[PDB]
Design a protein around this ligand. Sequence first.
Ligand SMILES: [Zn+2]
Ligand SMILES: [Zn+2]
Lengths: 284, 162
Amino acid sequence: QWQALPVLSEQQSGAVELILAYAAPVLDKRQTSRLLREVSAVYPLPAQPHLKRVRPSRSAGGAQSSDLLLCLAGPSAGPRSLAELLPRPAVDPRGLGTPFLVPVPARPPLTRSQFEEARAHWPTSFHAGQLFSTQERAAMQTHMERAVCAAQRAAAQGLRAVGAVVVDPASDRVLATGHDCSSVASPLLHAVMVCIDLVAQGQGEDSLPYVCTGYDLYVTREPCVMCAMALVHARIQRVFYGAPSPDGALGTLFRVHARPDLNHRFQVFRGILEDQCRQLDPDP
Amino acid sequence: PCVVSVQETEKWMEEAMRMAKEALENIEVPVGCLMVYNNEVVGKGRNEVNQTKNATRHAEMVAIDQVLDWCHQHGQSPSTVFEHTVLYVTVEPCIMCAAALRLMKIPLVVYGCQNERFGGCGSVLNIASADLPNTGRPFQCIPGYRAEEAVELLKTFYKQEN
Ligand SMILES: [Zn+2]
Ligand SMILES: [Zn+2]
């Protein structure tokens, strides 16, 4: 049992902002698909593809009813009749009730809790409220289990118990497995740094220095500032980690993956196999 | 044994500027750096990212690896060497290298111009002196040394790159 939580910039982490729109009740349910087609032809809502246009509602006895999202409200969100909003003969409004104002999510939700707030106002798309599919969650669990095994080998040898795996998501092929190898003689061999060197040494003659372009990293606990920024320089595409680290730079103390003033950004999800990972060592 | 190296600051930074000019000639981010321990250069490096095809091979990372080789080759513990070593680098260390120097417990960095794209001693983040109790020790900085020459090298590089 585990759950992947996006790690977003503080800007993207807050409540979704709302805009005003006009909806109308569908009084004749058998007109729904005709009205949906005619109304959305007139008002495609290009800037808001996340919004479902039909809002179902269930009464205290299980009777299904619907409201239809007509259009965004203008600069003067006054009461409006069907005759004012819907041009004819482009729309035959028969079957609709009187329009009413409703706040709707301005932007798609990204976190599961943003999807909860958003859903309360008007149905929204989202990537069920699942972030990753069953097939996906199973793949992610496999790679992290490999990272955990690497961290456990490290611990058995007396090395810092941190493990990491680099995956090419095109082929779901593992390109590097590594654990912390730091020693008195070589103190900077954190799991992530070992893995970046391994990916580098397997690349061909016509490679750019952005060793991690397009790849996923799974690491048992959240990277330190050195490893995190190394992933920015190497241009990792997504990082999955299990448990945070006290000085971590992908969620805890910094969010170097989600900055506007750095020339590379990437997605970070925390919590994958967290109960296993939480007992391993933090980074550094 | 720290301020004893600072006596030759001009000499060390001149060599660092020389190396930074080489890096520019070789289409690398023009950063040169030297690490000095007891008035002796125990390691040096230029940014070698394009040559090595490896984004982590910043000048400071190259310099650190050379000092660690020196420690290994002469039976010195890195702790006693790095804790009394001064880094001279033409450019404010980036977020990654700042963190690496904290973990090595380098006490002191002398540098030239700001690093506005990636700097970790103030420009983007202040990794150098941030309260990071599990990430080595903060270090102190002497910024601005020959900064005008150093930043002209950066400007030349970023005009030539795609
Ligand atoms: Zn690290
Ligand atoms: Zn650097």
